[PDB]
Amino acid sequence: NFKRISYAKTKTRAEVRGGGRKPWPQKGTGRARHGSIRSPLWRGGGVAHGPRGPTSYYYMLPMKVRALGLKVALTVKLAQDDLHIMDSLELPTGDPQYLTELAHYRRWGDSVLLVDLTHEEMPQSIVEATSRLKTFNLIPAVGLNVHSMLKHQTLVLTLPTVAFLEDKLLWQDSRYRPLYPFSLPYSDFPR
Amino acid sequence: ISRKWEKKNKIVYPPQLPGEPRRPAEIYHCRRQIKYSKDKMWYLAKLIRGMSIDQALAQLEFNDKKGAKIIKEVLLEAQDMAVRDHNVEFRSNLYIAESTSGRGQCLKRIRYHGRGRFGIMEKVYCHYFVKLVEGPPPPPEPPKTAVAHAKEYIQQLRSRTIVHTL
């Protein structure tokens, strides 16, 4: 929801074309009294309380909270025997059928999330096997998120990725309160 | 709109067995979009309801209403339709089983009134439905007699129990 923008919008009685003239005199006709033909009570009139988009739903959880949800997802995957550590994502062949028969023999699951350290150092073997599959997706370690971990049943991490995650997630557990954004120069950051 | 009345002459019954009794023939026919009121036409369809084909044609031949000449035309073409298409031997061996009127698709015109006032008049239309059945007209039910009234009253006196007890 933090990146949701609703584009729905309706027109009020002030935005519907026409509707400036009083339909008929206030008294005498024996009919109900109306001021415009575009009021909500009318057919073709404005919407009293409708969407007034574009509307944003932006909000931010505290950094320490968002970093803690990753720890829980990584912990739940291991406790439920859904986490698998690798040394390298290099396949013998770029055949997508091999990666599928390999996840069924080891009984991984119907969906697998492959996490590599960087996007440029990804072996071409695994890049050619996951580009043609739908449930075997490959992301870099920087793109790890609770939603994709929960959608996929099995999680696969490489050894470099493990060290990468521990460094980033444990830095929140021991850090000062920010004087200025962490994107600016600091004494010991990054590394 | 619905046109189910014309589809009732297309049902095909299975052949009857040797011991079963002769099945009477049923002939459905109608006329659509008649420039006439269904309320005025109802009095004509109620008249011939239950009559014989030849008796109904005689009552409609000397009636002054406009609907009479229309129904009589529908009965004459249902009579021929029965013997020609539905295997009816005698054209006089028919009676009016069902006869009613229905509302049709009507138009709307303006009727002018005084003081710049106006009314909305409708050009009325109607349908006429008739069902012919082979055989003589079923005998009318005799009026209830005193013996049946007394026989029914004593039957109510014998069906009464002791209420609100064991």
């Binding site: 008929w24 005498g28 006709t29 | 106006f118 909305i120």
Partner: peptide, 15 residues
């Protein structure tokens, strides 16, 4: 007691 008169209102012809 001002003279109060309501003018007739015609409806759309197409109806």
């Amino acid at each position: 007691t001002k003279k109060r008169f309501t003018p007739p209102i015609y409806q759309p012809k197409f109806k």
